[PDB]
Write a protein that binds this ligand. Sequence first.
Ligand SMILES: [Ca+2]
Ligand SMILES: [Ca+2]
Ligand SMILES: [Ca+2]
Lengths: 183, 45
Amino acid sequence: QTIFTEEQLDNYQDCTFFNKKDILKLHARFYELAPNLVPMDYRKSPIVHVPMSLIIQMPELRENPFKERIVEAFSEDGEGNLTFNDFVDMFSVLCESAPRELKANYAFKIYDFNTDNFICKEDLEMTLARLTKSELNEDEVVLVCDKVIEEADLDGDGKLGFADFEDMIAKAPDFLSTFHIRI
Amino acid sequence: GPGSEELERLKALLDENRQMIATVKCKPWKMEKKIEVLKEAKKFV
Ligand SMILES: [Ca+2]
Ligand SMILES: [Ca+2]
Ligand SMILES: [Ca+2]
């Protein structure tokens, strides 16, 4: 194996929930998305981006109702054209070993559709509509979010801060189901 | 309908005064015990 140096694999294993063997598997998957873009030899730390449009076609992501916003969350400019490091970071957050609070950190931002660092009724309607995959129509989503937003708003300001959100998802773990993706 | 299904479900989990009922599913208990515990708790709330 001459794709990575031993120090690179040490760092990857220490900074993610993957073992070295997993890292080599992830490089193969990354490389297969775009062999003309991705070096087979990473020992000099090349900098390459694979477009979001290719990443969201992987079978592990393509059915996820938040696939674009998940991939964008690990990109510098929010466009989801990931480096290998970004790609590894994202599947480490998504893996079985990652703690709930790490998943929650990314989920809060991905569900904060109007980017004001709280979850309001309207953020929650857009989130639930995607989570329920056409099982619920527009007003059925309203019905649900009406009751959730009051129950979950512990502090009393009409919106959910990150603490409210973490307490919510501890009781209703299905809000994090889209952040459990094995690769 | 589908909204009412989701609603009473999510509302069950998030009620801060009925967390005994909400957390039987988190216990290493057999189904029969979980069901008898929920029946009893629901009487006294
Ligand atoms: Ca918001
Ligand atoms: Ca409707
Ligand atoms: Ca609040």
